């Protein structure tokens, strides 16, 4: 099988920030820098 991400996959960084994908947003939404590039993941601060 070839898998790809999905709503309910678990992503974590090496600092121990775990969490599940709850929403894949189309590029139209998503915060973007003035130059045009959008970001790739929106990580809530309250978990800090």
């Amino acid at each position: 099988q070839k898998r790809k991400l999905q709503v309910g996959d678990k992503l974590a960084n090496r600092h121990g920030n775990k969490g599940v994908v709850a929403k894949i947003l189309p590029v139209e939404d998503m915060p973007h820098l003035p130059d045009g590039t959008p970001v790739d993941v929106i990580l809530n601060p309250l978990g800090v």
Binding site: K2, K4, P26, V27, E28, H32, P34, D35, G36, T37
Partner: protein, 230 residues
């Protein structure tokens, strides 16, 4: 309010700045966003829909004398961008007859009547002594992001369908600057940007785009159920 002035700084078959010099206060984002959005999603283009490789029976294969491996190859073919010339056209097949000790290179594709590979270089395969390559890669026209596990292209047995990135539009940004034009010091200067793969043209895109907003706007037309509890 006067009339605004359309200034277009179109460079190549991709990248083009577009300006409207005096717009009413606030009207920058007003216009230059629904535009950016429609642009980022609904301008249609072209994508490699399915492949077929010589003595290859699935996605998780590996061709003798080919450094690459079918996944890495498929991943590369993904990035190929084809131009369509004939608007009668809907889909065709590029043919990769490739041989021996050489470095395959996308331009190496067979030349086709009304077809234009806009990204020569771009690695397809490294071939080493012996390596034979024969491929047949489909290219359909479509809109948006429609992936393999959805559409599945049945071009024959052991074909493999590939995920499709259809949008020609590459990046879109818009700058709402302060213009100097003999009214207030409170007027916007919308300069839309846009980026492509030489298939659709920044303006061509920008046009197609407003047309969409114009039609969707045209929907607020025939009011239905009213007569609320008063």
């Amino acid at each position: 309010l006067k009339a605004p002035v359309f200034t277009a700084t179109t460079q190549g078959d991709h990248y083009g700045e577009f300006v409207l010099e005096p717009l009413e206060r606030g009207f920058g984002v007003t216009l230059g966003n629904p535009l950016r959005r429609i642009l980022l999603s609904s301008i249609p283009g072209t994508a490699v829909t399915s492949v077929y490789i010589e003595d290859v029976l699935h996605e998780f294969s590996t061709i003798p004398g080919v450094k690459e491996d079918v996944v890495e190859i498929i991943l590369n073919l993904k990035e190929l961008v084809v131009r369509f010339l004939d608007p009668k056209m809907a889909s065709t097949t590029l043919i990769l007859r490739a041989e021996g000790p050489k470095e395959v290179r996308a331009g190496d594709f067979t030349p086709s009547a009304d077809v234009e590979i806009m990204n020569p270089d771009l690695h397809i395969a490294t071939l080493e002594e012996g390596g034979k390559l024969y491929m047949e890669v489909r290219v359909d026209r479509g809109v948006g992001y429609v992936p393999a596990e959805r559409h599945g292209i049945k071009d024959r047995i052991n074909a493999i369908p590939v995920d499709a990135i259809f949008s020609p539009v590459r990046r879109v940004a818009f700058q709402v600057e302060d213009t100097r034009l003999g009214q207030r010091t409170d007027l916007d200067k919308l300069t839309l940007r846009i980026w492509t793969d030489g298939s659709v043209t920044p303006l061509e895109a920008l046009n197609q785009a407003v047309a969409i907003l114009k039609e969707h706007l045209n929907y607020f037309a025939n009011p239905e159920a009213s007569l609320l509890p008063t």
